[PDB]
Paper text:
They are characteristically inhibited under isotonic conditions via phospho‐regulatory sites located within the cytoplasmic termini. Here, we present cryo‐EM structures of human KCC3b and KCC1, revealing structural determinants for phospho‐regulation in both N‐ and C‐termini.
Unfortunately, the bias towards top views was even worse for mutant KCC3b‐PKO and prevented 3D reconstruction beyond 6.5 Å. However, we achieved a map resolution of 3.2 Å for the phospho‐inhibited KCC3b‐PM variant. A unique feature observed in the phospho‐mimetic KCC3b‐PM structure is the presence of pronounced density for a short stretch of the otherwise unstructured N‐terminus, a domain that has not been resolved in any of the previously published CCC structures. Distinct helical‐shaped electron densities are visible near the intracellular cavity created by the hinged helices TM1a and TM6b in both chains of the KCC3 dimer (red surfaces in Figs 1B and 2A), which allowed us to build approximately 30 amino acids of the N‐terminus, assisted by the Rosetta FastRelax protocol (Conway et␣al, 2014) (Appendix␣Fig S5). The direct contact with the ion coordinating helices TM1a and TM6b results in a visible obstruction of the ion access path from the intracellular side, suggesting that this domain arrangement could play a role in controlling transport activity. In line with an obstructed ion path, the KCC3b‐PM map does not show any densities for cations coordinated by highly conserved residues of the cation‐binding site: Y232, I148, P443 and T446. By contrast, no densities for ATP or ADP are visible in the map of KCC3b‐PM, which could be the result of small sequence differences in KCC3b.
Numbering used by the authors:
A (entry chain A), B (entry chain B): 102 to 123, 126 to 896, 903 to 946, 1028 to 1094
The structure:
């Protein structure tokens, strides 16, 4: 015993859940995977197409191409089920419908785009289902009752369209009144609607099976190879004997105007050929499948011809009774006419609030429902191919079979069971889609995702959409005005296809780009599956209509970008400013949840500009050289400290910030400026070195200016601060670039005709040292210079040579033998590193280093040079600075470099 | 006297310019707008289509639809000229070709996408132009010389294709050898090629004019309304009298097999109708334009019928001599066949290195060239409509006119002038495109934008592309294998259309999004123009072929995203990490060049977390409340200071940073963490408050915890620091949120059943105070509470009421009259503000504020409360803290708020 429903859950349920945040009522509706996602998805996938148009599709396509159609459609919907299940497992499943899951998983932008595309899909589905109920009622149930009587022969077809427009509008107003007053009854009878569907399908299968031994007696009159309609004919014989008199039969009256055979003038085809009774449903074992295994695709108005029976060759006798192809078919038309029979998988998660284990019921339930419906469709394709005549199939309005539903002829009890089950099922699906479209519309309105839809957020006392439903009815009316399933189906399919394409693309993107909170806990979901689904039914969209597809893509893109703009203006306060703000924040967040290191090391600079007492940059060359080093790409944070109290220097801080920004723009530096007003310059710099940049956009190198004239100045703070900064950089594990004689560094406008960047590779930290000159040579200033590596001190050397080879930029390496004592400070530091994982000697060896370095590189344009670490005791800081100063004595332009990190 | 060229400038020139950075040789090639951009664009727009296919297009389309075609094509190319001129004016114009301008203006990603799409365009253009030269040579000049002789009747069509494949491949190998050896000769004779084009067009116009009084004698034999071919017939008469004997004419031999009229069996149409000589070129004043003003669009193999002459009605006599429609035409086919006649506008800026005033010559020159060619095409459409028979036009191979070029019949001297001018012009355009395609390819390779194309960067001694040209020849070969202009033209047009679509879309985007360095200094460029162009010829792309267009879009999208990925990996060092890094940097940069303020104010928080001596967050509730306030969206920077020396606390800093990150993730705070190891907690906080965040992603509110137990602690630093931070926030012009009793703030899991957020709006800073509660109520925790504004102190009040109404969230405002003395500290501060633009009294009035505030709001869940500024003298800091403490004495949870900024 159960009272379940297949409808959706809109804002009313999501709100109930959110309020229930802070139960016995909830526990009772809890439903297992079967009755919670299998049956809702099954009842919503089985639409009207399977009946009113599957026989026609099989016939006009040939079992092979019909199999291809059903398989392609089922493939898009299955890959979308896998992607939607990936969405279902990821994170908590909201209590609302599938829209809320998709929204909370893909962000409001995709949520709103998918919501509106799926909503237009559902409205045009209410239109197609009402058209189908009207077509079944009007063509098969009560043909006599029509608003417009059949007039002449040319207009009779138009009269049917008018009959459908008027009847469909009346029926749509009825369905809207029903959903508005008494949707509870729809919930109550969803089970009866599913019963009708399943009884109908079992009747189809029972008929197909019974058709093996005892097939039914539905014969078709056929004149030669020209199929005749049997709506008015009684006997498939030229002369109908009456009262022992061979009076001519009515068909004579329909091909000959005498009607008394008194020297009757019968047309050509009638006199030559013969009328025959062809069994319309041969046995399943009869083997007709071999006959109808091939496409027909006859254009509009062509007579339907069985290519089996005999025939004369005369032509010209065009007649009304000849059953005609009612639409110019094609493959791309058949896929569109058939696709709205696989839509409805989002209904699998339309009942997610009333579930027990959502992430477990929804994926399995949805995929099993799609497997069931795909098997039903792919099996019925073959059964129709192998049980129905290849001519009764192409009859799209049950002509030639006395006006019975084509699939109806295959049933155990009678075609009536199917002709009524399809009518009740199709009106039930119409009611379902007139409840599912406005609930989704009020959920998109209540989310305030899109502003102008705010009017439709208004709900009834019970939380029913009063003003969303009216718009849904208006759009369904616009649909019904095209009173033909064959023309509404491409539009419906295009909207649902856009919904499925976005659901597959958002998943593929969020899996590739490592979007935060994208944890698809599914045992079989791989982004290639969602991508293959997106591709399959992008192709499906375009195949069915290349102009409708572009219109849908542009509509969805505009809704998406407009939702993004409104979200920006909502959270940041401005439209485009806030849009870029959100882009930056989202990129940085995505940047956080990832491996901290990078497979390659690239210097992201923090230029430490020193501000004089006039608050002017004491070294613009720092910026010039930073621009040359980064070449306008990458991250360059220009930091500077203003000594003083912040409470009274805010104006100065703003002025100096504008100054530094103008200087950066003048030196073609693309980057950011940050000023810290600090009480102590050393502490200000120690805070800039470790705090610049938003998390994930940190620097990794600190570019400093050498403290020129340290000995001359009486104050010892200037030289002692540089060492303090060096220690801070080393402790923070950042690279260090101490530029010396920076006043002589070349400007952005001048160039070097010829020169040598003399990188000195010493025992360790070879990665940064080698990488620098090439980044410099990539700039126009240092473009025309050569590179010479004067190595002083096996496996690492070989690795370096290989890395240079990969670099592909010409560089010559020379190894100069040096006494260990001369390089003692280096070897000492290296030993300290290996174990981790004097002054007179240091100076007397630094002068040897001077001898070699000047003798080899005196005339270089830029001498890179590895650094030794600062002393452990801060007492030998003077000795350390003297060591550096002598080590660099006599060189024109030195870039002291210290790795101090895992640089690769 | 001048020796100019119309070719492009590749890497060789761009490199020369860059080297010349640091002249007499350059000055001599300087060329004015006319000979620099007008004539190159004019010589490259006038292709083969105008001749070999314009007459056919006019005929098979009708002057009206042909006018529509030419106008739509010219409209896309004109809007693209406007967008390309906007690119040309913006910034310095590089010396290379149009590729370099487009690259430096739209970034390397669009540069490479446009480069490759335009390159495939140019290669398939070399294929079409070689096919055209072969078709002209083979069909009109020397029909007798063909590799394959006519095969039967129907096959003869296939034989022509083989004749074209073999001749075209031979000609393509010739053109490749010519461009490889002696491109200088191509530069020398570009002027002769332009001469041929212009002489040909003036000959067309002179013929059209001469056709007013004296039209030429090109008659056409027509049998009834069936046009006959005249390649073999001599007299348009059934019987050709020979030697005074009325012997039957050859056409008798082509419709009757007797050939001697001895009881000849002539077919039906021949015996009934009559052969007539219809003047093929009636006068311009004859008025035939009224006849050919309508489309024909006859499908393949249909006989071309003049709907003017008399005719019998018998049918069946299918014959070889009946001129047939050679391709199943349609509008969408004609637009594709005609579009490669408007392409070539990027050649306007193919000579930008040798210009005087680039930003002035290129826009005017290009637009004038497009106006000239559009006028020539739109004028020739009408002239062909009004001068050529409506049957000679639909003849696509000069049949029925004795095998002469259709447009050739309209010329002053003879059709020979045009038939040779078109051949020389088309081989010249083939040479041009086999020099323009490989130059562009080596420029895309040398830029190292795309890695795998690196092989093609290899150049000859002079800087000619040795290995790019071979690939261009291979792709042109693949094109020639489809030996028909009518089938190569859609592919060429699709590639060039993709190039133009990207050139229009990049401009529209960079204008809307305010991309840095996008200064379009043009007097008429508006992004709506570029957008309209993008839309027009996106429609053109899809119209011509919906599957080729998707293939082109996907190819261009993949090249674009792959270039973006390679740039990320190049500059940042990682692929996806670096990709997000570049996205963030670009967003922040774009964010810098904009108005600093925002039309709306939204709190971007800096949570100041206090770290205890155990290095644990002393107040997680700060984070919880920050999460509730921002609701997971926006910017939240969690800053904290570790007291100590950074040189030895790096490990602790990393540990505490991980701790704070885990806490943030536990409290659902999405944001970033920054630790500053400082010598003094107060100075560390003063540096965090002013330095957090990358420029443009700054905070604007500082969220602090109240210094609980300030009086109990003997140390006065704890209470004095809070005031110092308040002063720093106020001076920095940031908002301030002092949370008091923060240990009692509700957690993210619990909720409030019912409660009142009692915002106290006091004299000023009403914007932040009102905005806060609504952001709080937007969270599930504070969702179920109400809001009560207890205003204490006209126009501003009305503005506040209106703002509350806009907010749309229910709130009740109560104004309580209070004595000015009680609010003295507030009124005093307000007066200080108005002028800019005791303690016993303060305490005795704070207790009155206590009386009122507790009597009204004692049981509130959260009391917001405006703050007075800190005292000017730092001596009264104890009095200020006592004032605050009493003012908040007895309230459960207080959020002291201070605006101190231009909050709106
Ligand atoms: C149903 O019967 C009609 C009556 O003959 C068929 O019409 C004619 O069918 C032939 C195929 O048998 C069509 O092609 C013809 O083929 C012969 C084979 O040699 C060829 O000699 C003819 O020139 C022609 O190509 C023919 O077009 C068609 N119509 C006429 C006016 O003859 C009809 O095809 C039959 N239906 C099916 C499905 O076969
Ligand atoms: C060139 O001459 C031929 C020879 O008659 C034309 O063929 C026939 O042209 C008529 C139009 O006059 C086509 O339509 C017919 O119209 C009459 C008008 O009453 C109608 O009674 C017929 O039933 C038919 O609809 C006809 O299809 C066409 N072919 C045959 C076999 O008759 C041809 O149209 C002429 N070309 C042009 C451009 O007019
Ligand atoms: C029509 O029927 C007669 C006798 O039943 C038969 O002889 C004739 O061949 C038939 N014609 C065709 C086209 O089958
Ligand atoms: C053919 O020509 C004869 C005499 O010139 C004329 O009488 C007849 O009407 C013509 N037939 C047609 C169809 O014009």
């Amino acid at each position: 015993m159960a009272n379940y429903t297949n409808l959706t859950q809109g804002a009313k349920e999501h709100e109930e859940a959110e309020n229930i945040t802070e139960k016995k009522p909830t526990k009772t509706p809890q439903m297992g995977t079967f009755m919670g996602v299998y049956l809702p998805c099954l009842q919503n996938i089985f639409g009207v197409i399977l009946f009113l148009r599957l026989t026609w599709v099989v016939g006009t396509a040939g079992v092979l191409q019909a199999f291809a159609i059903v398989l392609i459609c089922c493939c898009c919907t299955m890959l979308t089920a896998i992607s939607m299940s990936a969405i279902a497992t990821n994170g908590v499943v909201p209590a609302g419908g599938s829209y809320f899951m998709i929204s909370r998983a893909l962000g409001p932008e995709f949520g709103g785009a998918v919501g509106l595309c799926f909503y237009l899909g559902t409205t045009f589905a209410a239109a197609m289902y009402i058209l189908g109920a009207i077509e079944i009622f009007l063509v098969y149930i009560v043909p006599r009752a029509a608003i417009f009587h059949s007039d002449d022969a040319l207009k009779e077809s138009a009269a049917m369209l008018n009959n459908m427009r008027v009847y469909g509008t009346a029926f749509l107003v009825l369905m809207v009144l029903v959903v508005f007053i008494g949707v509870r009854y729809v919930n109550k009878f969803a089970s009866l609607f599913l019963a009708c569907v399943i009884v109908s399908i079992l009747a189809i299968y029972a008929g197909a099976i019974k058709s093996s031994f005892a097939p039914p007696h539905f014969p078709v009159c056929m004149l030669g190879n020209r199929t005749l309609s049997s709506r008015h004919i009684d006997v498939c014989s030229k002369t109908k004997e009456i009262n022992n008199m061979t009076v001519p039969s009515k068909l004579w009256g329909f091909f000959c105007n005498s009607s008394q055979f008194f020297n009757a003038t019968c047309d050509e085809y009638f006199v030559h050929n013969n009328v025959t009774s062809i069994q319309g449903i041969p046995g399943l074992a009869s083997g007709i499948i071999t006959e109808n295994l091939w496409s027909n695709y006859l254009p509009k108005g062509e007579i339907i011809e069985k290519p089996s029976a005999k025939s004369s060759d005369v032509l010209g006798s065009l007649n009304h009774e000849y059953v005609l192809v009612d639409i110019t078919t094609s493959f791309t038309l058949l896929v569109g006419i058939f696709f709205p029979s696989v839509t409805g998988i989002m209904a699998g998660s339309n009942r997610s609030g009333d579930l027990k284990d959502a992430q477990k019921s929804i994926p399995i339930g949805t995929i099993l429902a799609i497997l069931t419906t795909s098997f039903v469709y792919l099996s019925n394709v073959v059964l129709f191919g192998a049980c129905i005549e290849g001519v009764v199939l192409r009859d799209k309005f049950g002509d030639a079979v006395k006006g019975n539903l084509v699939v109806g002829t295959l049933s155990w009890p009678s075609p009536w069971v199917i002709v009524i089950g399809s009518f009740f099922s199709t009106c039930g699906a119409g009611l379902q889609s007139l409840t599912g479209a406005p609930r989704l519309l009020q959920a998109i309105a209540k989310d305030n995702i899109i502003p102008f839809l705010r009017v439709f957020g208004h709900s009834k006392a019970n939380g029913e959409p009063t003003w969303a439903l009216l718009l849904t009815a208006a759009i369904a009316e616009l649909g019904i005005l095209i009173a033909s399933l064959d023309l509404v189906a491409p539009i419906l399919s295009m909207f649902f296809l856009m919904c499925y394409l976005f659901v597959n693309l958002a998943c593929a993107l969020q899996t590739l780009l490592r979007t935060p909170n994208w944890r698809p806990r599914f045992r079989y979901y791989h982004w290639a599956l969602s991508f293959m689904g997106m591709s399959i039914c992008l192709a499906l969209m375009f195949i069915s209509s290349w102009y409708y597809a572009i219109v849908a893509m542009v509509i969805a893109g505009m809704i998406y970008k407009y939702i993004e703009y409104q979200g920006a203006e909502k959270e940041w306060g401005d439209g485009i400013r806030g849009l870029s703000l959100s882009a930056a924040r989202f990129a940085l967040l995505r940047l956080e949840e990832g491996p901290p290191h990078t497979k390659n090391w690239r210097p992201q600079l923090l230029v430490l500009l020193k501000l004089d007492e006039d608050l002017h940059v004491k070294h613009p060359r720092l910026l010039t050289f930073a621009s040359q080093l980064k070449a306008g790409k990458g991250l360059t944070i220009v930091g500077s400290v203003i000594v003083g109290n912040f409470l009274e220097n805010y104006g100065e801080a703003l002025a100096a910030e504008q100054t530094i920004k103008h200087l950066m723009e003048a030196e073609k530096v693309k980057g950011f400026c940050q000023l810290v007003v600090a009480a102590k310059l050393r502490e200000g710099i120690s805070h800039l070195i470790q705090s610049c940049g938003l998390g994930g956009m940190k620097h990794n190198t600190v570019v400093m200016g050498w403290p020129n004239g340290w000995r001359q100045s009486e104050d010892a703070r200037a030289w002692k601060t540089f060492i303090g900064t060096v220690r801070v950089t080393t402790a923070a594990h950042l690279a260090l670039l101490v530029a010396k004689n920076i006043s002589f560094f070349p400007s952005n406008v001048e160039q070097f005709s010829e020169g040598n960047i003399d990188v000195w590779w010493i025992v360790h930290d070879g990665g940064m040292l080698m990488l620098l000159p090439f980044l410099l040579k990539q700039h126009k200033v240092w473009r025309k210079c050569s590179i010479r590596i004067f190595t002083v001190a096996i496996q690492m050397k070989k690795d370096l040579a290989t890395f240079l080879y990969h670099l592909r930029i010409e560089a010559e390496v020379e190894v100069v033998e040096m006494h260990d004592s001369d390089i003692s400070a280096y070897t000492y530091e290296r030993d300290l590193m290996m174990e981790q994982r004097s002054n007179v000697r240091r100076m007397h060896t630094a002068v040897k280093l001077n001898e070699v370095i000047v003798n080899k590189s005196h005339e270089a344009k830029l001498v890179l040079l590895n650094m030794p670490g600062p002393p452990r005791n801060p007492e030998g800081d003077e000795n350390y600075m003297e060591f550096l100063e002598v080590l660099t004595e006599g060189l024109e332009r030195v870039l002291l470099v210290r790795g101090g990190g895992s640089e690769v």
